Amino acid sequence: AFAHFVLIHTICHGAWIWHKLKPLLEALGHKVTALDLAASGVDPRQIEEIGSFDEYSEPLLTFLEALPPGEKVILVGESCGGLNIAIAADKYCEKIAAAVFHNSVLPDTEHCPSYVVDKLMEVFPDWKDTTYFTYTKDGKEITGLKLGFTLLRENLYTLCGPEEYELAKMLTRKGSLFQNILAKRPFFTKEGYGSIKKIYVWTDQDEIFLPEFQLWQIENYKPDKVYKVEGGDHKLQLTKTKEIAEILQEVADTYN
């Protein structure tokens, strides 16, 4: 079977992170959309214009609004992209065949939306040469960050080639987790986000989303299906591109 995959990058990143996986999925016959979220990739906004994870998610919500009735997609979110998935699913649950989490945060419906982010910061508190700044939007102080190049090299792109690490140095931009905004956001709903099928994909060799964190998430909110990829790094769409495409084909043949 063929599906329409919507690929959702993480904070400080853009559609470009999917530059290897998108053509591979298309060679299997799928339709693929790889979005730039707000103030990401070549989107023309700057992060200081964005006031929350929901506003950050606008291009995904606008895309889903534009799907004609009856068309469903499979969302694929990497790292922090899981939060964008939950926000989208509380607005467009009927257009989502399933959601795939790719070394990603897995929000739930019983705890506040910041819950798994707070836990991530406990498990991985030292972001190395990452820098931080503060800005104000809609009366709230938001912490912005710029991922540090050592952190990129050692922890996110550990086993990626130098030409891929180079793309990350060139193209990563200031962003935000909006942690304090999430912490005051209404909970993700059970009828919306809660109802979608969730597939959890991960590697135990991830040097930032460490096994203690990913196994904690799986126990906290049971996925419908779990796939463990052997080897690679946090950026499995670069280091295990073919394996990720194989998994996504199976998801396409399972959920519609």
Side-chain angles (χ1 to χ4, degrees):
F2 305 140
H4 185 174
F5 295 102
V6 179
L7 312 179
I8 306 156
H9 67 77
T10 185
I11 62 163
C12 297
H13 285 66
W16 53 267
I17 194 60
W18 303 109
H19 81 280
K20 289 178 72 169
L21 181 62
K22 175 168 181 297
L24 191 48
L25 291 170
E26 293 170 343
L28 288 167
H30 306 293
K31 171 63 168 170
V32 185
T33 295
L35 297 174
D36 282 325
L37 296 173
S40 305
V42 296
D43 185 90
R45 294 169 279 196
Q46 305 297 307
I47 200 58
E48 295 84 358
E49 307 172 50
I50 312 306
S52 71
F53 228 105
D54 290 74
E55 299 168 48
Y56 172 50
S57 303
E58 169 271 316
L60 173 60
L61 302 176
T62 294
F63 191 80
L64 293 169
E65 183 69 22
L67 291 167
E71 291 192 15
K72 299 174 180 172
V73 297
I74 302 173
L75 303 184
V76 186
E78 57 134 15
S79 194
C80 296
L83 283 156
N84 308 104
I85 285 174
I87 293 165
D90 270 351
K91 213 111 275 215
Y92 294 110
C93 63
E94 80 286 355
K95 313 196 163 179
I96 300 161
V100 187
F101 301 81
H102 172 296
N103 292 319
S104 171
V105 298
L106 181 66
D108 71 8
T109 58
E110 307 311 283
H111 306 98
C112 65
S114 64
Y115 188 63
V116 304
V117 177
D118 296 333
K119 181 75 183 180
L120 168 58
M121 296 310 164
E122 290 184 21
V123 173
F124 197 83
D126 187 359
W127 293 50
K128 285 179 175 173
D129 55 341
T130 294
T131 55
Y132 298 101
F133 57 102
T134 66
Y135 65 94
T136 300
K137 196 63 211 276
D138 304 330
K140 298 295 173 170
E141 180 188 86
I142 293 168
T143 298
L145 83 170
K146 197 185 182 281
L147 299 173
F149 289 177
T150 296
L151 187 75
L152 294 169
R153 173 76 277 180
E154 295 184 353
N155 297 86
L156 283 58
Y157 294 75
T158 314
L159 298 184
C160 296
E163 82 281 8
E164 300 288 345
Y165 174 56
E166 189 75 33
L167 281 165
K169 293 202 289 164
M170 290 171 160
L171 297 173
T172 50
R173 294 169 53 182
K174 301 165 150 216
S176 181
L177 289 146
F178 304 94
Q179 182 172 17
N180 58 322
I181 314 294
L182 284 169
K184 291 190 180 195
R185 177 197 200 282
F187 284 30
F188 294 122
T189 68
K190 290 173 258 294
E191 272 276 272
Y193 179 58
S195 72
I196 71 158
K197 297 284 167 273
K198 303 182 188 71
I199 301 81
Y200 192 93
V201 185
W202 73 296
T203 174
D204 70 17
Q205 298 306 294
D206 186 331
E207 305 278 12
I208 176 164
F209 281 34
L210 305 186
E212 180 191 347
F213 175 71
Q214 303 219 51
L215 291 162
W216 175 88
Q217 292 205 116
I218 292 165
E219 178 70 3
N220 179 63
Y221 197 41
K222 191 174 132 232
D224 294 286
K225 176 54 185 257
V226 173
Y227 296 87
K228 191 170 171 297
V229 179
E230 300 305 314
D233 66 12
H234 185 59
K235 296 311 196 180
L236 286 169
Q237 71 279 79
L238 303 175
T239 47
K240 297 285 175 182
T241 312
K242 171 204 132 297
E243 290 78 3
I244 293 302
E246 287 172 0
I247 283 157
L248 290 175
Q249 177 67 57
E250 186 163 82
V251 174
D253 294 332
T254 300
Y255 306 95
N256 59 209

